Amino acid sequence: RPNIIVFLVDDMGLMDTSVPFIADESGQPVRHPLNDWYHTPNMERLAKQGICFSTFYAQSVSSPSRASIMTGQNATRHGVTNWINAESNNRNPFGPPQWNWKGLRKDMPTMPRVLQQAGYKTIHVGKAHFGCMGSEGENPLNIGFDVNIAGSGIGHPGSYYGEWGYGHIKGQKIRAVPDLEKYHGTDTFLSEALTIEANREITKAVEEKRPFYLNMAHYAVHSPFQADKRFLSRYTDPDKNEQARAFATLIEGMDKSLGDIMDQLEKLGIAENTLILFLGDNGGDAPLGDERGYGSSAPLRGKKGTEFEGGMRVPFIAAWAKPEKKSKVQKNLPIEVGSMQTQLGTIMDIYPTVLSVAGCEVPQNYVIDGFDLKKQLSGKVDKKRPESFLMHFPHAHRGSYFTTYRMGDWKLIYYYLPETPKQPKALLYNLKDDPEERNELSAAHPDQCREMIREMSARLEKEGALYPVDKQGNELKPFVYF
Ligand SMILES: CC(=O)N[C@@H]1[C@@H](O)[C@@H](OS(=O)(=O)O)[C@@H](CO)O[C@H]1O
Numbered sequence: 001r002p003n004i005i006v007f008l009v010d011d012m013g014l015m016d017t018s019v020p021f022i023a024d025e026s027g028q029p030v031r032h033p034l035n036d037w038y039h040t041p042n043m044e045r046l047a048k049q050g051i052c053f054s055t056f057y058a059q060s061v062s063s064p065s066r067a068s069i070m071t072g073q074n075a076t077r078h079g080v081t082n083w084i085n086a087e088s089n090n091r092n093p094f095g096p097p098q099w100n101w102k103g104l105r106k107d108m109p110t111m112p113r114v115l116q117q118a119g120y121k122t123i124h125v126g127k128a129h130f131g132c133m134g135s136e137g138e139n140p141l142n143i144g145f146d147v148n149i150a151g152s153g154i155g156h157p158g159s160y161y162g163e164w165g166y167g168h169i170k171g172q173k174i175r176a177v178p179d180l181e182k183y184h185g186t187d188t189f190l191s192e193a194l195t196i197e198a199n200r201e202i203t204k205a206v207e208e209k210r211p212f213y214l215n216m217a218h219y220a221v222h223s224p225f226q227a228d229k230r231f232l233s234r235y236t237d238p239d240k241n242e243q244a245r246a247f248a249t250l251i252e253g254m255d256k257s258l259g260d261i262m263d264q265l266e267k268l269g270i271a272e273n274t275l276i277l278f279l280g281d282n283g284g285d286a287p288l289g290d291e292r293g294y295g296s297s298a299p300l301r302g303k304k305g306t307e308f309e310g311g312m313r314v315p316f317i318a319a320w321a322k323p324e325k326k327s328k329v330q331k332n333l334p335i336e337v338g339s340m341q342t343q344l345g346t347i348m349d350i351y352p353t354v355l356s357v358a359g360c361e362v363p364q365n366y367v368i369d370g371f372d373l374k375k376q377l378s379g380k381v382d383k384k385r386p387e388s389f390l391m392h393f394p395h396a397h398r399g400s401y402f403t404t405y406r407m408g409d410w411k412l413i414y415y416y417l418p419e420t421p422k423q424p425k426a427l428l429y430n431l432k433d434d435p436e437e438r439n440e441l442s443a444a445h446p447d448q449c450r451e452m453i454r455e456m457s458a459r460l461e462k463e464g465a466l467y468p469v470d471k472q473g474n475e476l477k478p479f480v481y482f
Pocket residue numbers: 010011061062063083084129154155156222223285304305
């Protein structure tokens with residue numbers, strides 16, 4: 001039975017790496033300027049041994065994505081449609097009153113809980129953000145983890161600096177990272193402290209002779225953008241401000257962590273037995289350019305928390321830590337080494353892919369929104385899964401009170417506009433012809449737009465979505481307004 005590592009980077013979009021995730025018309029990687037700015041040599045090492053997905057969808061912000069990864073359910077269905085504010089219910093003015101602020105529940109068959117039931121040692125390290133303060137989900141031990149280092153209801157760290165006690169000595173006390181007291185006062189960067197702790201848990205799992213699931217959930221690369229002195233000297237582009245250079249150092253330190261975990265697997269002799277899934281949790285938050293133009297994920301439009309592709313396009317790499325044709329466990333999930341997969345995947349697809357390789361099954365009667373990636377991981381187009389992603393955000397952020405719906409080449413953006421709830425607005429893009437969202441064409445294809453609204457409307461109902469409300473609590477369902 002294989003070990004599984006989900007290496008999840010906070011606020012890391014598809015361009016925040018030296019690995020090119022943009023595909024040309026031949027399905028081959030194309031280098032863009034951000035790929036020559038970031039330095040992720042261990043991601044390059046992992047891409048050499050595995051498969052990159054060029055189109056991989058997450059939700060637009062943290063808790064919705066982290067809920068979706070744990071449950072295999074869309075944010076419509078698990079109900080965590082906003083990032084969770086630990087201290088108070090952040091519905092936002094027009095948010096659904098019954099949205100799942102409390103978060104993941106002790107009774108949910110989460111990926112870790114199903115693995116734990118099967119005898120896996122399940123380890124959580126770093127950012128959890130599965131529940132509010134005082135909730136079941138605040139504590140990863142309540143949703144199927146045997147071990148939690150540094151996870152709580154917090155969604156970012158009080159500091160990256162060990163000298164600042166990660167918030168306990170200096171910085172934001174109410175976001176102080178827990179469980180790392182032995183690093184306080186030292187010059188150990190938060191991302192380094194988490195790596196040391198993860199490698200200690202991996203070592204302990206191997207000596208106990210149990211297969212493990214490691215949720216390596218970095219606080220990197222979320223603000224505050226506090227530069228790592230180990231890497232800052234490499235970042236000197238005159239058109240990148242101090243914040244962007246700090247962000248680049250959080251990326252490079254994240255990549256060092258990935259390398260130290262891969263080295264530890266090789267040192268223990270278990271690399272042949274360990275699957276690594278690498279992704280970000282939502283659209284990239286790099287402090288570059290213009291938030292609703294081109295910057296954080298150029299050449300794609302937008303940023304973390306927007307309705308654009310930059311809001312929800314994350315990097316995704318799957319690789320055996322040491323590929324080996326002889327390996328029994330690798331025959332259950334063969335990966336085309338050094339290749340790019342251009343067919344769409346989503347964070348809901350992780351649940352069914354991991355449970356199958358682990359020798360478990362998706363519980364037959366548990367309704368999921370994910371598809372086993374086995375066929376796509378071999379480097380083939382999988383006709384058993386749709387080219388579709390539905391990103392429901394009935395809350396306030398860089399974009400507000402919207403649903404996006406992608407079906408094949410087409411993307412609908414529906415704005416509920418709760419302040420003028422009788423006059424909603426729909427936009428239409430052809431992402432095949434216009435991947436940078438430059439050519440809004442609802443006026444030119446009014447029937448494609450009408451059809452997408454009906455399909456999206458039916459899918460929101462099928463998934464049990466909670467809708468935004470107007471000032472007086474009237475439920476705002478999408479409708480063909482024209
Ligand atoms: C504009 C922006 O990005 N705001 C983020 C918010 O989205 C959330 O981050 S999130 O990664 O959890 O979604 C929160 C976590 O405490 O931190 C804020 O700074």
